[PDB]
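so im writing up the methods section and need the Non-structural protein 3 record in one place, dumping it here so i stop losing it
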Amino acid sequence: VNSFSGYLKLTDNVYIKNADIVEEAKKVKPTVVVNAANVYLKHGGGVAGALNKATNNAMQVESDDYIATNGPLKVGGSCVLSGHNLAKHCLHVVGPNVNKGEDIQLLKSAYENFNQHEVLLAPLLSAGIFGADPIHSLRVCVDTVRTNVYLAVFDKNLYDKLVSSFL
Ligand SMILES: Nc1ncn(C[C@H]2CCCO2)c2ncnc1-2
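--- predicted struct ---
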């Protein structure tokens, strides 16, 4: 048993809810919250800016030190950093950004990072401002992630569309 509440079950291991990933993290304090990161860990908007704002910019300070030491992530890659006040850990995952021209095939590689963690609270990668089709992102998630993933979809008519259209 875990603390996640109000989720619709899509598959054996994937669950979905209409919720802000920030509000959910503050309530649950999950072991792992996933950030929709970029390779520079510049947390300006979408999930990264909201998560970072909720940490009072401590996520950005930590991220800047990570990049200064290690250099940028790969598209499709990830790193584990602190979850600050939101979670034990934050898994920063870089999905491809369609609005920058990145290969959508890298979305599967991005979701494979989730399999290193038994349970995660996550957004849909590459959806929203990243330019990918969220219906596609949910299909890749279900077909790639084998660990238990709780998807928070912030946008209301998108949640309803994802559920209604789910195969
Ligand atoms: N605070 C937040 N900002 C942005 N997104 C992404 C967009 C695209 C899907 C619906 O929301 C979030 N997902 C969960 N929480 C989110």
